Design a protein around this ligand. Structure first.
Ligand SMILES: [Ca+2]
Length: 708
């Protein structure tokens, strides 16, 4: 995705901060490679923001507004017919959904911020941007080093120490090996640090003798043999990667884009999007308005923006009456100490962000406690007016709400918002039981005409039995279960649950005892064909690590087509009891964890954990490498046998977790990858954060092999 020329040429803005009240003129740019959004002050200083760190961009009325009187005067915000809203730009960045930074800009020229917002987000959100080769992430480092210059236009040696902080002596030695100065207060001409010199620097700092071991120099014939035998035109690869094929040439080849750990086409939108809505796994958030714990902490409408921007397609609104003297509907976790937001604010947030990154339909799960015709009427009017044409207010002509009629497809409902709401306890012991399980979901109130009229394809009803649901044969009825109730059902009525999910929707949500907003592991519910397995997006624990990872695929649309046997009515499937037909494309996966590079910002021992998520009958062994030989985190090499996952039964449903840890089990980076997206051979596995964001420094070198 090429960086448009105007972005690299730059535009004039005033950058402002509310906490400091400082407003400074800047030129804003994206570098030609699209690694950094950066701004340059009049005094020549620069600040950089990784493109991969950007979560959203906002223009006009959606941008952040200056709150201090000092800044309001500067921007003439107390004036009739001012052009301030034609000048505002906000860039939102952060390592997860909650820890957000707002970078705020006001353009000198009118209207330019719209293009900046749209084009920058397009670069950030392209499924391939985060999935570049190891070489690209290494290049990102080089570009930073060469752009962050001192007063004399030179690279301070201290910037090398900051970039590679684990071992100063080794950095000094690598600079010296390149005939560059290594003095603490020395500086380097950027002209003396082109790509080949950078490569030499890396080879000195981070030697790769484990790659030299594959040479058992290469010619055309020998390298062709390697590519055809191990990795599952050759002279052109030598010309591209050989510095003078040498060991170093092989290093760069193996770090290059010709070698991809993923079948990258699978990151793009590519699933059949024309099947009934309930034939997909749907990315789903629980108690979306909460930023932290379930019992206390801030509620924020910003959570709706954040989850929707990551392709979440099902969110939750817990609606309550205003607290007298207030008479305006609010969103909060009832009977707790969580803060309140206005219902209106949530609708405004959803309307803004709903289709920015995915065009496919969203479902709003209302948990309604507003036992007021007036306040329900306000709720319904907010939805109708703010969502406008986005709101699905009536069923589609092709899909009437009658027995035997399937749900419409994601494609049939492109750009539509669907409302899930009802459509037309007392003592200490009972309270405790409810709090431990369904929580406030056990306390919903009757819907009146205004709210009822908005409900069509997602009608919640009390579950009776799978037999009863099958008899009634209504695809437009949804059943919701706590993790506890659904576990009881999937354990005791597995086949019936899968069959239910071929016709109707189920939504799963965390039990009430999880007051710290911990998550349950989603796999067992996906295994039963459950579509909306709702998790707390503010908690990037293992469940969310998996959720973010698997939903990155299919364009981060928030929809993944379920396995054929979870869809077609003529093949009964039981995830606990596979048959001959189920296992037709079973595979055995071997992964060898060979070595790691720049794994930590400090010298500490490290190890790698590997496991598989999948069916009950899938291989359950969890592997760990030994600790690294020493506290060397620059280039540890392990001496491990392949980790074998024998008979992955239905690879489409399985994912491989590879997680890198410091001694003590402190997270450094990970990947969770659907089995069918993996390429075989020697690869440099670039590591992601808990929230699946690409990390620049750390990588693993691995060998993958798959057999029938
Ligand atoms: Ca709720």
């Amino acid at each position: 995705p090429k960086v448009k020329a105007y972005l690299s040429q730059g535009e004039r803005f005033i950058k402002w901060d509310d906490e400091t009240t400082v407003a400074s003129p800047v030129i804003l740019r994206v570098d030609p490679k699209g690694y950094y959004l950066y701004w340059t002050y009049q005094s020549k200083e620069m600040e950089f923001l990784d493109i991969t760190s950007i979560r959203d961009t906002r223009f006009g009325k959606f941008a952040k507004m200056p709150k201090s009187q000092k800044l309001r005067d500067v921007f003439n915000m107390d004036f009739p017919d001012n052009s301030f809203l034609l000048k505002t730009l906000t860039v939102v960045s952060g390592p997860d959904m909650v820890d957000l930074t707002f970078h705020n800009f006001v353009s000198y020229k009118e209207n330019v911020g719209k293009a900046w917002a749209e084009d920058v987000l397009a670069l950030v959100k392209h499924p391939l941007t985060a999935n570049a080769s190891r070489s690209t992430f290494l290049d990102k480092i080089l570009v930073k080093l060469k752009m962050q210059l001192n007063s004399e236009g030179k690279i301070p040696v201290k910037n090398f120490f900051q970039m590679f902080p684990a071992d100063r002596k080794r950095v000094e030695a690598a600079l010296s090996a390149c005939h560059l100065p290594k003095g603490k207060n020395d500086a380097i001409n950027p002209e003396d640090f082109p790509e080949p010199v950078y490569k030499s620097f890396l080879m000195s700092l981070c030697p790769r003798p484990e790659i030299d071991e594959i040479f058992t120099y290469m010619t055309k014939e020998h390298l062709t043999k390697f590519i055809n035998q191990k990795q599952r035109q050759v002279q052109g690869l030598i010309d591209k990667y050989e510095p003078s094929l040498s060991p170093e040439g092989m290093v760069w080849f193996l770090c290059g884009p010709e070698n991809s750990v993923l079948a990258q086409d699978k990151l793009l939108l590519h699933h059949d999007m024309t099947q009934p809505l309930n034939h997909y796994f749907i990315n789903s958030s629980h108690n979306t308005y909460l930023t932290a714990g379930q019992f206390s902490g801030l509620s924020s409408a910003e959570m709706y923006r954040q989850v929707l921007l990551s392709g979440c397609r099902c969110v939750e609104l817990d609606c309550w009456k205003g607290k007298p003297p207030d008479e305006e509907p609010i969103i909060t976790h009832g009977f707790t100490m969580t803060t309140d937001i206005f219902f209106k604010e949530a609708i405004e947030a959803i309307a803004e962000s709903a289709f920015k990154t995915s065009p496919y339909p969203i479902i709003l799960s209302f948990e309604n406690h507003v036992d007021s015709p007036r306040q329900q009427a306000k709720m319904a009017e907010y939805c109708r007016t703010i969502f406008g044409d986005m709101l699905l207010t009536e069923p589609l002509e092709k899909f009437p709400l009658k027995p035997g009629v399937p749900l419409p497809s994601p494609e049939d409902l492109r750009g539509k918002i669907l409302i899930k709401n009802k459509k037309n306890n007392l003592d200490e012991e009972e309270i405790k039981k409810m709090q431990s399980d369904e929580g406030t979901a056990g306390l919903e109130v009757t819907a009146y005409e205004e709210m009822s009229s908005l409900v069509n394809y997602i009608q919640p009803t009390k579950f009776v039995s799978f037999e009863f649901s099958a008899q009634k044969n209504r695809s437009y009825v949804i059943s919701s279960f706590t993790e506890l109730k659904a576990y009881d059902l999937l354990s005791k009525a597995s086949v019936q649950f899968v069959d239910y999910n071929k016709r109707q929707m189920s939504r799963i949500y965390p039990k009430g005892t999880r007051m710290d907003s911990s998550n349950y592991m989603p796999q067992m519910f996906w295994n039963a064909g459950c579509q909306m397995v709702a998790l707390n997006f503010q908690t990037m624990d293992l469940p969310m690590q998996q959720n973010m990872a698997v939903f990155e695929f299919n364009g981060q649309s928030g929809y993944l087509l379920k396995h054929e046997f979870m869809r077609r009515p003529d093949k009964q499937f039981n995830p606990f009891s596979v048959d001959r037909i189920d296992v037709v494309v079973a595979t055995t996966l071997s992964i060898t964890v060979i070595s790691g590079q720049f794994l930590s910002e400090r010298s500490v021992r490290t190890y790698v954990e590997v496991e598989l998520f999948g069916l009950p009958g899938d291989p359950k062994r969890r592997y760990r490498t030994k600790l690294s030989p020493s506290t060397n985190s620059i280039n540890p090499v392990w001496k491990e046998e392949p980790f074998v996952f024998e008979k992955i039964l239905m690879p489409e449903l399985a994912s491989l977790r590879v997680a890198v840890m410091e001694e003590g089990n402190k997270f450094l980076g990970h990947r969770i990858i659907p089995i069918n997206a993996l390429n075989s051979g020697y690869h440099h596995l670039c590591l992601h954060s808990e929230s699946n964001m690409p990390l620049t420094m750390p990588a693993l070198f691995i060998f993958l092999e798959m057999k029938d």
